[PDB]
UniProtKB/Swiss-Prot annotation:
Pathway: Amino-acid degradation; L-tryptophan degradation via kynurenine pathway; L-kynurenine from L-tryptophan: step 1/2
One of the record's GO molecular function terms: metal ion binding
Tissue: Expressed in mature dendritic cells located in lymphoid organs (including lymph nodes, spleen, tonsils, Peyers's patches, the gut lamina propria, and the thymic medulla), in some epithelial cells of the female genital tract, as well as in endothelial cells of term placenta and in lung parenchyma. Weakly or not expressed in most normal tissues, but mostly inducible in most tissues. Expressed in more than 50% of tumors, either by tumoral, stromal, or endothelial cells (expression in tumor is associated with a worse clinical outcome). Not overexpressed in tumor-draining lymph nodes.
Gene of this entry: IDO1
Leading EC class: oxidoreductase
Descriptive protein name: Indoleamine 2,3-dioxygenase 1
Subcellular compartments: Cytoplasm, Cytosol
Lineage, broadest ranks: Eukaryota, Metazoa, Chordata, Craniata, Vertebrata
Amino acid sequence: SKEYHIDEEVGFALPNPQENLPDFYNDWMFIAKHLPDLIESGQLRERVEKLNMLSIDHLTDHKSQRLARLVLGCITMAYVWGKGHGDVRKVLPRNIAVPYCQLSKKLELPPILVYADCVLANWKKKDPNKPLTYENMDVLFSFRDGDCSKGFFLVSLLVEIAAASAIKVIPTVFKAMQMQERDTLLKALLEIASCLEKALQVFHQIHDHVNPKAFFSVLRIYLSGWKGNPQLSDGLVYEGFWEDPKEFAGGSAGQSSVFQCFDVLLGIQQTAGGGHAAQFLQDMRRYMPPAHRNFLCSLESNPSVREFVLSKGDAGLREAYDACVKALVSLRSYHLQIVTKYILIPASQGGTDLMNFLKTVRSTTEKSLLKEG
Ligand code: HEM
Ligand SMILES: [C-]#N
């Protein structure tokens, strides 16, 4: 893999994210670093509104630009949703909206908190000389005390990273296919499956660091966007940058290139059709870092692993291939149980389009199995 911005140990996540910005931006940092407080004491909005329009020209490298995106991102969410009880601002102050939109255009991402922001770039290791384990990690920004943002963001991060171990073998896969190296292809496929089976394990941690009510009633609120959202019908107006209000989708792990990449790799057509699920997954790529979406399509232009495995009456291969597909459905099936627990139940103390979306994606994955009939 070339510079598709994919680290060997961390995958799609940003390696060693930047924690501090140039003093020139201390005003931004302060708000971001004290969001839980400012929000609760009800002085957040007033503070954003007192901000001077800062220029983004002093954000020289990528990482510093990403940090910035995170800060302005978190701030924008806090501002729009407030204490997150129903009182929402429909207009984002030009002093903040401008830099944010300019930085966004520069990074080729929409002006709203995105997965690549609050997960991929929102972390740090407590002890630099220790492994990447929950215990040795922390997020950079949170919305409100007890919103379980650490648990959510980090467990996603950790799953993201577990899946990163397979990304590195993708090249091996394609090489083997043209070099007609059957034993190499088989090895590779199983390795991938193994990594996807380990990611599921990592996923279990979600129960240990995220409480259903807190998640459903708080975090979920701040991660909401303004596309097809009843309380922001026509979107959000980025004062001083755009004429009319713009609609954008909230942050969601659905923006992770990880799962999409494997669906591609394995020839699963999540994106095909005119269906609602397909449109959503296709649309979410717009929310992924440009480098990453480039990676996703470069894969799409490679020869099909599925067609290859099928064209070879080789059980070993078919099975190894199914192993990977089986791993995905397993992850998704587990993900459903999780939504049930962290959304369905909490909301019961309409939202079925949710379950049908997920089940359609899952179903599509299953359908790709080879030796099922
Ligand atoms: C608190 C736990 C979690 C909840 C409540 C949750 C909820 C949801 C919901 C409601 C969707 C549907 C679309 C949307 O609104 O964005 C979704 C999609 C998705 N989530 Fe989660 N999620 C959770 C944890 C995770 C974790 C830890 C991962 C792992 C990185 C993950 C990966 C995905 C993916 C890839 C999709 C998109 C569709 C697909 O490929 O199947 N989620 N999630
Ligand atoms: C999934 N967020």
